[PDB]
A paper describes a structure:
The [name]-like proteins are essential for expansion of the phogophore membrane and mediate targeting and assembly of protein complexes to the autophagosome. In these experiments [name]α was proposed to act as a selective autophagy receptor, targeting a restricted virus to the autophagosome for degradation.
Crystals of a complex between RhT5 88–296 EK/RD and [name] were obtained and harvested for X-ray diffraction analysis. The structure was refined to a final R/Rfree of 25.9%/27.4%, respectively. Two copies of RhT5 88–296 EK/RD and two copies of [name] are present in the asymmetric unit (full data collection and model refinement statistics are presented in Table 1). The two RhT5 88–296 EK/RD monomers are arranged as an elongated antiparallel dimer. At the interface, the bound section of the long [name]α helix occupies the same groove on the [name] surface that is used by a typical LIR interaction. By contrast, the second hydrophobic pocket that is typically occupied by a small hydrophobic residue is unoccupied in our structure. Glu192 forms a salt bridge with Lys51 on strand β2 of [name], Glu197 forms a hydrogen bond with His27 at the C terminus of helix α2 from [name], and Glu206 forms potential salt bridges with Arg69 and Arg70 at the C terminus of helix α3. The structure now presented here demonstrates a second mode of binding where a helical motif occupies the same binding groove on the surface of [name] with the large hydrophobic pocket similarly occupied.
Residue numbers in the entry:
A (entry chain D): 4 to 116
B (entry chain C): 4 to 117
C (entry chain A): 95 to 287
D (entry chain B): 95 to 277, 280 to 287
The structure:
Amino acid sequence: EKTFKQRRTFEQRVEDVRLIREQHPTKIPVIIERYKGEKQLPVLDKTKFLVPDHVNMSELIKIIRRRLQLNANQAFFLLVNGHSMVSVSTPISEVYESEKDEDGFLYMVYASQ
Amino acid sequence: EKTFKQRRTFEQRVEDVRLIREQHPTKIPVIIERYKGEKQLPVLDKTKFLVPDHVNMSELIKIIRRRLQLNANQAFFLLVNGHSMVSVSTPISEVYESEKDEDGFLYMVYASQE
Amino acid sequence: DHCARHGEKLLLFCQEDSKVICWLCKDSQEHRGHHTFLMEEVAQEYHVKLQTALEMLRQKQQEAEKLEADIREEKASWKIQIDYDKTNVSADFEQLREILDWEESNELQNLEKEEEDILKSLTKSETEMVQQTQYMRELISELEHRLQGSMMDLLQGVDGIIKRIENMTLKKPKTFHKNQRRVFRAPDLKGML
Amino acid sequence: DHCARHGEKLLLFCQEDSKVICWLCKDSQEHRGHHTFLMEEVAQEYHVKLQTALEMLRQKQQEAEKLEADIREEKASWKIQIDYDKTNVSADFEQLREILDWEESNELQNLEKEEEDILKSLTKSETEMVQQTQYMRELISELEHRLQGSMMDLLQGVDGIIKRIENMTLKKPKTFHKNQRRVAPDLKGML
Ligand SMILES: [Zn+2]
Ligand SMILES: [Zn+2]
Ligand SMILES: [Zn+2]
Ligand SMILES: [Zn+2]
């Protein structure tokens, strides 16, 4: 099993970021994958997410909770670049401007164990 | 791992055949997969092949031999619909008109030992 | 009971104010000029009126509960419709991906056919070149034998060999350079979207 | 050696036929009228001529080997070029597939947002409907209490309740039907 950065090269990823930002300027591209060794949670089919600008982290958390088919009681952690900074109230634009990768994407991982 | 008929339904396959025949009328669509229990040969990345009409079975067999990276001495069996009819000289148009599936594709399988 | 403002019994009913009062309240400015009756006089009339009102309210409450069930069933139907639409969109994208796979296979096979043609042409030309090199080697060996052996060996048929060497037209190999094209799908669909 | 046709020694050389013969072959009709010399007279001349010919042929054979190496290198370069082109085409198709995935994700998120909005609107409308049903039940209970209790209970403030029931405008829930669209194979036509 190969991750996203292993399926595509760096320049290809930068070109993808450029083309997507040219097509969807009002949205942010986010790559969300399961942890390397997580067993309690399944693997989502979709890997790429376009999140509006004005939207905060709460809507993204709710999108992930809806995709994963999770009951309300159980909670989960959504780490950015492998490290949590879940200021749920902050808009995702600030998260993008602060913690985006070198290629231009915003990488996140979900776990619970 | 799911085969072609398991990844797509029958009506979807018929629609795919129709679209391909509309786009490439001078070509025949062929689905080629590995045998269910053959181990000596690996699994090819590509599954679909568009073969011209005038072309005979020899070009398809040599394409499969080049994709699999096999020397000339080692031989393999290429069965159509689960039954051998490798008349290498016959054009692929006759093979398609005689042994095509119900949906419209042409299914083949490659094997080697026993 | 008795009145809180004056202390007399509440035996009256004001048609205008709809409040029960006493006789002292009727003469004061609070209920002055209104029409006043006894409570026992309008009891049956208001009783049957409120009975008909109760009938209407029962019917309307039944209708309202039906409306509630209707909106519940509607939101269920709408979630079903949204699921249908999502599956439809995913199936359309899968169809597009399949035809893309087929086009990729077609282009790859075209390039392989072109490679096969070029390679067979170059192999025939290389066969011609190696044949001419072997012919050169054979002539060199014959001339060596001519220069080492007898005088009769040297002179017999020497003009034939000389004339064979006179017509030495060396053959050039076949070649082609950058006279091919193989364009794939240009991102015009991105503008179309 | 000796001649096979006549039996005499082969000591002569015919300038025209380039064949060594005997003296009997010179007078016969086979080599009649031709010019005949001794082998030793033209030996050195033909020797140096063939020496220069050998030198030239060595040079030409080196040139031919160079041409052979050239065509080999050309076919190698062409196979490399074809491999490069195949990888390029596959990479372009993979790029197309990636942007296709991104567009699919965008459309899916749009549909999910629409579903969430519709569901929350319908939930608010359902809350309004259950509130109005509870209000109806409350009014029914109040009228029952009025009709079962005292006469003052029945008559006090009856006109207010009567007029409140007169203005009984029942409220309809919000609804929508078939005013949405999903989504075309124009790329198939462009080819
Ligand atoms: Zn009073
Ligand atoms: Zn009054
Ligand atoms: Zn003689
Ligand atoms: Zn002569």
